[PDB]
Structure formats: structure tokens, C-alpha cells
Amino acid sequence: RDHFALDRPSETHADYLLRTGQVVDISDTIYPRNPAMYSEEARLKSFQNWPDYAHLTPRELASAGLYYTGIGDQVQCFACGGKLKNWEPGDRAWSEHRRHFPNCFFVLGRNLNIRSE
């Protein structure tokens, strides 16, 4: 019969929460387009032999969700898929990433621990 007096009928898990919660962010997926550099450390490898005049720091790029494709000073976002070339002095690595691709789920909430609050 109705074990537990009901059997957790009202809300059980995501599959059930879908009725209201809904997992679909904005109906456009959101999985990384290059997990190879999902971790900051891994991203480091991306900048294997990072020049000294590129434009910005290699790590910072990783922290910004940018993976180097060996194309000179051209970096791209492995998450949403935002490539940017022809950088200039002053334009923050990801600062231009959002300007040309502001729909990056990483840009907004940053992602990763970095709780603080």
C-alpha cells in the first residue's frame, strides 16, 4: 500500500522537479565545448610556451575560461565557444570575450569554488 503514508509522492528528484524546477537553463544547452581544459591547471598546458608580449597572462586566461589554440595571441573560450584575435593593450582577456560573446555562462557567475559570500 501507500508505504510511509504516501511514498514521497510530492517531489522526489530532478526528474520529478522538472514539473516546476526545470533543468533546462534557457533552452540552449550549456556543456563545455572542450573539456580538455575544464580545470585551470589543464588550461595552463594550453599556453605551452606562452610568449612574453602576447597581450595578457596565460593563467588569467584560464581563469577566464580561455584555452590557447596555438594561434599566436588568439584565445578562445572552451565553454561557449568564443574565439578572439587581434587583441590590444588594455583589453582585459575575457573583458573582450564578453563584449564579443556575452552569453558565456562562465563570464557571468565565474564558476568554480570562489564562494567568498
Give me the least distance between CB of 40 and Zn ion, in Å please: 15
| Burial (Cβ within 10 Å: 0-12, 13-18, ≥19) of residue 89 | exposed
CB of 62 or CB of 77, closer to Zn ion? 77
CB of 8 or CB of 99, closer to Zn ion? 99
Give me the least distance between CB of 47 and Zn ion, in Å please: 17
DSSP per residue over 75-115, as a string? EEETTTTEEE-S--TT--TTHHHHHH-TT-HHHHH--SS--
CB of 58 or CB of 82, closer to Zn ion? 82
The separation between CA 26 and the C-alpha centre of its own chain, rounded to angstroms, equals 16
Count of positions on this chain that bind Zn ion (CB under 5 A): 5
Residue numbers 67-106 binding Zn ion by CB under 5 A: 77, 79-80, 82, 104
